[PDB]
Design a protein around this ligand. Sequence first.
Ligand SMILES: [Zn+2]
Length: 47
Amino acid sequence: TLPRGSIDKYVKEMPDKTFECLFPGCTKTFKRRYNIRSHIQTHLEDR
Ligand SMILES: [Zn+2]
């Protein structure tokens, strides 16, 4: 009754100011920011 352990199961935060969405099928990398996290929402939101 509380989903909150999948958004942090596919994120590779790099100390070089980078990000690697570890989602299976995904292939987009971002930088030090909390925007890709919301991107993981559309990941398991409907697609
Ligand atoms: Zn992704």
